[PDB]
Ligand SMILES: Cc1nc2ccc(C#Cc3nc(-c4ccccc4)cn3C)nn2c1CO
Ligand SMILES: [Mg+2]
């Protein structure tokens with residue numbers, strides 16, 4: 001009731017910045033997340049006991065894969081927190097409530113394999129969900145955990161507010177399917193530029209929350225260079241394991257997933273920053289000006305990858 005979560009001073013200050021790294025002490029990640037809910041949403045958004053129990057069941061349903069793990073979930077939530085704290089007044093109480101939960105849950109029970117490997121292996125999830133295979137799984141895992149006893153953090157919401165928040169969470173989690181990102185950012189580009197973009201148009205809000213989700217999900221490219229470079233090793237550890245699995249099915253993987261083509265990583269990251277990251281943070285900064293530090297950090301990391309290619313590191 002009178003119970004604030006507080007962090008040590010360096011964390012209390014640095015958590016407010018976009019480039020914050022949540023650190024290697026796993027047992028602090030739940031308290032970091034509660035801290036962000038309390039400041040973002042309020043000390044009364046959730047019953048603490050239900051929230052704590054929800055966080056620990058979410059944590060237990062992330063697997064120990066190199067990249068798509070519990071650390072990625074809390075990292076993507078921290079980026080969302082920074083966005084919401086720098087754009088206070090643009091977001092409903094339900095959106096604040098739902099989006100941090102969406103980020104924490106967005107990769108639930110990930111196995112370190114793409115939608116594309118599931119379809120080729122013919123995994124049961126690919127017959128249950130023909131598109132956004134893993135992302136429909138993540139949402140379904142979210143609803144499951146929410147329906148466990150004493151886990152309903154949304155218990156105090158009205159019936160219709162409940163249905164609204166679960167609909168925000170669903171669209172937020174679906175939007176993390178990067179295949180959907182390209183069309184969504186193109187449409188937001190055009191709507192912003194012709195001056196049609198309208199935040200009272202719910203279907204416009206949806207697209208903007210979609211773009212934030214892509215931004216939070218890729219936020220590893222906006223960290224300090226050593227964080228960005230070491231996270232890339234985890235990202236490629238998964239891609240190469242998937243490449244190995246492709247070869248086991250008799251399929252030559254794309255070069256991104258072929259550990260034999262390790263040497264071209266620098267050039268591959270460059271393509272990824274130019275094709276995906278830069279456009280994403282450009283359009284996001286256009287629509288939400290206080291998110292510009294994400295664009296600036298992304299550009300500093302692209303420059304670090306250029307430096308790697310030129311032999312300067
Ligand atoms: C947060 C985040 N999320 C992602 C997802 C993908 C990617 C990437 C990639 C890539 N690599 C190659 C490549 C590599 C070696 C040989 C040939 C091609 C091609 N592409 C597109 N990065 N990424 C980061 C930043 O690390
Ligand atoms: Mg995902």
Ligand SMILES: [Zn+2]
Pocket residue numbers: 072076106107176217
């Ligand atoms: Zn993710």
